[PDB]
């Protein structure tokens, strides 16, 4: 900064500067610290702090100048690292901040505590046990204040202390395992303040905003998060401090205390040893079932969340031959409650399904369990979740997404005596495939997983009926609604799943789908959709095999036009080349129609080169080369066939063998080749051996680097290169030893 920063600093340090001059400049200084990177500001940090501390000092009469300077400190902490390093400069900064927290003005008071929070978040290691009680006294008093903006800073401070000390606990745990001293050692401030922290936080849980709002962030919510972070930070230590509050207020006539009891209990469910928490959950269960039917909307919401958190963190307790029946019964009714409650109920069911599935007995010769502890309730709970789906208020609290997520999870994690209900409800879900698609992000992957799951375990004719529904929904989708880029991609990946499971039986749907597959391959602008469409063709090649023949003319046309287009993202090219191999492998001799142009494309793509410097392009070249090798492999094998002798059709690839082996030889000579490329090269060499015979051996032996590439492959770490390089060596050895008479 040529002259600017010094000008600002001088206008604060100057004793003749007016109240306006100092105050306006510190705000200007403050915003500058929010702008530039430490590149310029770390030289000036010595001078910027001089002006900042000058404005915060006890001796400054104006509170406006104090606030401006205290706010400026907050923004400058990103590069006070070198100043915090020396203890005397640290002693001065800390004293100024601590004295600023005692200022009669509230605006300064809050900003001074904001500093303690951020300093704690950044420089934990530089805080000595010396500062321990000093910081404890200021932040605890901040917590006990009637002003909410003051209370929030006191709570956030310890939440940040917990975050830092949890990472240090992790740091110490791995250091012990490895037999090392931890790089940094925890000072356990949270453990030492826990006695005093919990009574305050439990009491702050009683100050809920009766006029409820999710956007608003207040001391009551912060307290809940704080107790939760204290539970994971201090583990079993927290239990004796929170439990007497819970037990005393769980049946308080005042809803605010009753709500605090269920919250506090829910907050301590992770951290302490599950062996302590399980009997406590069992003890609290009857009361928990009562609190589900609480008159107060607030208590129910917290009760559902507590139950929903029990099911996730402590599954063995949620399943109980004693309380399961009344638990499931009240969760059913909870789906008819407000979205605040019903969403957590959905979450509870999903965890219960996983819990009941994991626990279920599976014969050690069988795939799935015959029965599980949700079988009696299965049909009822899966029906009420679908009705929860039809709720016109499903948008709020994300009820609709929670209901579908449950429905899927329940259907996935199910016993055999639930299969009729599984099949019925999964038909309904697939009927609404469009709005499930157009609906967080894992929901689509979980939908593909469940569809994959159901199709495999249900009776074959029932899987065909589900497949009929899925395709009926997708074909209606494409033909009705416009077609969003993210939506189409998810729709294609959905098709991929069905194809991979159905195999050759997908041929039913091939007619009605081919236009929409074509739209995907024609989508140059949104290449992610394109890549998915390219991927699907390969899946179709493995599924339909030679039955894809009457669909190849068009597909091949689209794939070749895609390659000829100069504006298609580079990711698409190698995938199309790979899929040429899948086509040739599927259609066999029928490929002769496309052969010339494909071989000419592969030849051009193989000779493509990028410069050594570009780290990204070198990774791309190998991805392109891998696809080139794969393509040839699919072509050589495809025209060869699976018979006794080689089909004469491969002799059309014979003129290309010289180029192919030169391409492999050039790959071998390149030190920067990948294990995937080496594997694909070794694979191709073996293929050439089986197709063309002893001549290949001679041409391989004349290119000595190929011998080295094979040696490298058999010794490689990966399973792919190991297997294929051994196979090519074996195939080359067969050609070496053929026509040799054996003797005893």
């Amino acid at each position: 900064s040529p002259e600017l920063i010094p000008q600002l600093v001088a206008n604060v340090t100057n004793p003749n500067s007016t109240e306006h001059m100092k105050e306006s400049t510190l705000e200007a200084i403050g915003y500058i610290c929010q702008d530039i990177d430490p590149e310029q500001l770390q030289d000036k940090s010595n001078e910027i702090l001089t002006a900042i501390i000058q404005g915060m000092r006890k001796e400054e009469p104006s509170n406006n100048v104090k606030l401006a300077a205290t706010n400026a400190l907050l923004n400058s902490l990103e590069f006070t690292k070198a100043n915090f390093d020396k203890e005397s400069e640290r002693h001065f900064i800390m004293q100024v901040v601590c004295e600023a927290t005692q200022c009669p003005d509230t605006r300064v008071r809050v900003a001074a505590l904001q500093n303690l929070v951020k300093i704690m978040s950044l420089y934990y290691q530089y805080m000595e046990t010396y500062m321990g009680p000093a910081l404890f006294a200021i932040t605890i008093e901040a917590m006990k204040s009637d002003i909410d903006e003051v209370a929030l800073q006191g709570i956030e401070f310890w939440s940040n202390v917990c975050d830092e000390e949890m990472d240090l606990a992790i740091e110490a745990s791995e250091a012990a395992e490895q037999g090392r001293p931890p790089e940094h050692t925890s000072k356990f401030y949270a453990k030492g303040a826990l006695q005093y922290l919990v009574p305050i936080l439990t009491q702050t849980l009683t100050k809920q905003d009766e006029n409820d709002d999710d956007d608003d962030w207040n001391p009551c919510k912060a307290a809940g998060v704080c107790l939760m972070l204290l539970a994971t930070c201090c583990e079993d230590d927290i239990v004796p401090h929170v439990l007497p509050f819970i037990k005393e207020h769980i049946k308080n006539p005042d809803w605010r205390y009753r709500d605090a009891a269920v919250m506090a209990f829910g907050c301590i469910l992770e951290g302490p040893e599950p062996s302590q928490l399980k009997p406590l959950v069992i003890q609290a269960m009857p009361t928990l079932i009562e609190l589900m039917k609480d008159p107060s909307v607030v208590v129910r919401d917290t009760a559902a969340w507590t139950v929903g958190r029990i099911c996730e963190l402590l599954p063995e307790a949620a399943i109980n031959d004693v309380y399961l029946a009344p638990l499931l019964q009240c969760l059913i009714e909870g789906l008819s409650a407000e979205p605040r409650v019903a969403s957590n109920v959905c979450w509870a069911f999903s965890s219960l399904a996983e819990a009941a599935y994991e626990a279920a007995d599976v014969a050690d010769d069988q795939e799935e369990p015959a029965t599980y502890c949700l079988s009696s309730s299965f049909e009822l709970i899966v029906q009420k979740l679908l009705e929860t789906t039809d709720r016109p208020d499903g948008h709020q609290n994300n009820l609709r997404s929670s209901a579908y997520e449950s429905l899927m999870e329940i259907v996935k994690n199910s016993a055999k005596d639930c299969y009729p209900a599984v099949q019925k409800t999964t038909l309904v879900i697939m009927e609404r495939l469009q709005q499930v698609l157009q609906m967080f992000n894992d929901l689509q992957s979980l939908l593909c997983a469940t569809l994959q799951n159901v199709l495999r375990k249900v009776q074959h004719q029932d899987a065909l009926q589900i497949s009929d529904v899925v395709m009926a929904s997708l074909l209606r989708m494409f033909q009705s609604t416009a077609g969003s880029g993210g939506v189409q991609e998810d729709a294609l990946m959905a098709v991929s799943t069905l194809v991979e499971v159905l195999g050759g039986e997908f041929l039913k749907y091939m007619e009605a789908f081919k236009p929409f597959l074509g739209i995907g391959l024609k989508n140059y602008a949104e290449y992610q959709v394109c890549l998915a469409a390219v991927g699907l063709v390969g899946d179709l090649c493995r599924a339909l095999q030679s039955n894809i023949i009457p669909f190849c003319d068009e597909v091949m046309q689209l794939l070749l036009e895609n390659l000829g287009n100069e504006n298609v993202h580079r990711s698409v090219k190698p995938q199309i080349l790979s899929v040429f191999g899948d086509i040739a492998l599927a259609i066999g001799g029928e490929f002769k129609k496309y052969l010339e142009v494909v071989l000419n494309t592969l030849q051009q793509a193989s000779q493509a080169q990028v410069d050594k410097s570009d780290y990204d392009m070198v990774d791309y070249l190998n991805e392109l080369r891998e696809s080139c090798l794969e393509a040839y492999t699919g072509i050589v094998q495809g025209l060869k066939g699976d018979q006794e002798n080689v089909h004469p059709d491969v002799m059309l690839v014979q003129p290309r063998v010289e180029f192919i082996l030169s391409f492999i030889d050039h790959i071998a000579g390149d030190e920067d080749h990948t294990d995937g490329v080496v594997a694909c090269a070794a694979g191709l060499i073996g293929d050439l051996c089986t197709a063309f015979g002893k001549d290949v051996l001679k041409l391989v032996e004349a290119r000595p680097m190929i011998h080295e590439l094979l040696t490298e492959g058999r010794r490689s770490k990966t399973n792919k290169a190991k297997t294929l390089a051994t196979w090519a060596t074996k195939e080359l050895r067969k050609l070496k030893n053929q026509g040799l008479t054996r003797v005893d």
Binding site: N441, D442, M493, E500, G535, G538, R542, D642, G686, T690
Partner: peptide
């Protein structure tokens, strides 16, 4: 989104392995 990238990578790997299984069947391996 980070969730959509991993959803994309997982499918490509699966398609690549299924391709390898089909070719190695034609090659007669393992």
């Amino acid at each position: 989104s980070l969730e959509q990238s991993e959803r994309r990578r997982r499918l490509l790997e699966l398609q690549k392995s299924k391709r390898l299984d089909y070719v190695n069947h034609a090659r007669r391996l393992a």
